[PDB]
A = this chain, B = another copy of it.
Amino acid sequence: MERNKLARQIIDTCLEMTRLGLNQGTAGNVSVRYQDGMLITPTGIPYEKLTESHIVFIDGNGKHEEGKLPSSEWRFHMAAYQSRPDANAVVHNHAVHCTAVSILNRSIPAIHYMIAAAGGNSIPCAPYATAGTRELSEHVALALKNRKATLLQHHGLIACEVNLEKALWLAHEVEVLAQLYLTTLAITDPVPVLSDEEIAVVLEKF
């Protein structure tokens, strides 16, 4: 749990995310809870040139290390950490199916039992606000109150979990659920879903 071990894993999550097909338009950013703030990916540097020393520390006050530029989307990473104390890692991306559902401004309903992985019977969609603003941060903090992942309208996805492995896994799972919802929505609307009682049993079970 040294700084450089946490920097290496951030980078491996960047690479793994690209290999899985979630980082298209070379748009993601990844962070971990650390000391009084977080370690996050820098802005501008392509994932493949990233080295341990590129990773930036941002404290609880929002001040970042000297001579390093944190991701341009860092504020809602900080908002996730303060809204969900149990979150230790955050994955953000512009994965295509998720972003496509976020353009319809729809929530993803319980079309598969794996929806319970993010905490309830849906995957919310928070309202649009200009990227990088205080207003975007508030909507994300309210959406993550009772869910571990949220879509952001006209934008993409945020997923948070106890470690980087699980956070990437969740992010990927939401992209599968997003693709299943768009695939069936083109055939029939609305899409058949499992009932709230059925989702309650699955939740107990997990």
A155 within 8 A of partner (CB) = yes
Contact with B along A163-206 (1 / 0, CB 8 A): 00100010011001001101111111101101000100110010
Q: Which of A57-65, A78-86, A110-118 contacts the other chain?
A: A110-118
Cβ–Cβ contact A24 & B172, under 8 A: yes
Q: How far is the CB of A6 from chain B (nearest CB, A)?
A: 20
**How many A residues are at the interface, by size bracket?**
35 or more
Q: From the candidates B155, B179, B180, B205, name the one contacting A130 in the complex (CB within 8 A).
A: B205
Q: Is the CB of A192 within 8 A of B112?
A: no
In the docked arrangement, what's the CA distance between A26 and B105, Å? 27
B205 with A99: CB separation less than 8 A: no
Q: Contact: A154 with B25, CB < 8 Å? A: no
- Identify the A interface with B (CB < 8 A): 24-27, 46, 94, 96-97, 99-100, 103-105, 111-114, 128, 130-132, 154-155, 165, 169, 172-173, 176, 179-180, 182-189, 191-192, 194, 198, 201-202, 205
Query: Once the chains are docked, how many angstroms separate the CA of A103 from the CA of B185?
Result: 11
In whole angstroms, what is the CA distance A182 to B183 when docked?
A: 8
